[PDB]
């Protein structure tokens, strides 16, 4: 565990994080896919073999021996509010499962269902109040990674509002 399990923001591209694991925003078929997802494929290649996974789910596969969790996120395109806002929950509590599993001291994490997946809709809180809701049990430092400047403002206050 961490010694004082803690919450972070970075506005950066995830492929540069200096956590001990990583959670990709990944599609259910395993392709490369965009954003988030494409900058994973081309850092962490190996990872994407075998990690085609339901909505709602998460798998990792090692690239050597760090850990990529592959978490599957619903497209707010395809689901009803309410069914993809359980399957945004079980997505994020089946992150915090793996990172548990593996022993890892540190994560880095996106907020899932936020980009091509939002239904064109702001999804902020939704997906970080799920984030924090999974995480918050576990021990593992929390690294949120973004790459709007307001969302950086606005995942900051939300982090230190509950310390
Ligand atoms: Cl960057
Ligand atoms: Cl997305
Ligand atoms: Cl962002």
Same mark, same amino acid.
């Given at each position: 565990?961490?010694?004082?399990? %803690? +919450?972070?923001?970075?506005?950066?591209?995830?492929?540069?994080?200096?956590?001990?694991?990583?959670?990709?925003?990944?599609? *259910?078929?395993?392709?490369? /896919?965009? /954003?988030?997802?494409?900058?994973? +494929?081309?850092?962490? *290649?190996?990872?994407?073999?075998?990690?085609? &996974?339901?909505? /709602?789910?998460?798998?990792?596969?090692?690239?050597? &021996?760090?850990?990529?969790?592959?978490?599957?996120? *619903?497209?707010?395109?395809?689901?009803?509010? %309410?069914?993809?806002?359980?399957?945004?929950?079980?997505?994020?509590? #089946?992150?915090?499962?793996?990172?548990?599993?593996?022993?890892?001291?540190?994560?880095? $994490? *996106?907020?899932?269902? &936020?980009?091509? +997946?939002?239904?064109?809709?702001?999804?902020?809180?939704?997906?970080?109040?799920?984030?924090?809701?999974?995480?918050? %049990?576990?021990?593992?430092?929390?690294? $949120?990674?973004?790459?709007?400047?307001?969302? #950086?403002?606005? $995942? %900051?206050?939300?982090?230190?509002?509950?310390?």
């Amino acid at each position: 565990g961490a010694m004082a399990p %803690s +919450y972070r923001v970075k506005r950066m591209d995830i492929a540069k994080n200096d956590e001990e694991c990583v959670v990709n925003a990944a599609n *259910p078929r395993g392709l490369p /896919g965009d /954003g988030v997802c494409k900058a994973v +494929y081309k850092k962490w *290649p190996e990872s994407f073999k075998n990690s085609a &996974t339901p909505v /709602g789910t998460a798998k990792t596969v090692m690239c050597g &021996t760090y850990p990529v969790i592959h978490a599957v996120g *619903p497209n707010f395109s395809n689901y009803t509010e %309410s069914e993809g806002d359980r399957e945004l929950a079980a997505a994020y509590r #089946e992150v915090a499962k793996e990172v548990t599993r593996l022993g890892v001291n540190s994560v880095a $994490i *996106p907020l899932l269902s &936020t980009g091509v +997946y939002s239904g064109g809709k702001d999804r902020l809180t939704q997906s970080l109040n799920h984030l924090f809701t999974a995480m918050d %049990s576990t021990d593992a430092d929390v690294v $949120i990674y973004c790459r709007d400047k307001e969302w #950086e403002k606005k $995942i %900051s206050e939300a982090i230190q509002m509950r310390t």
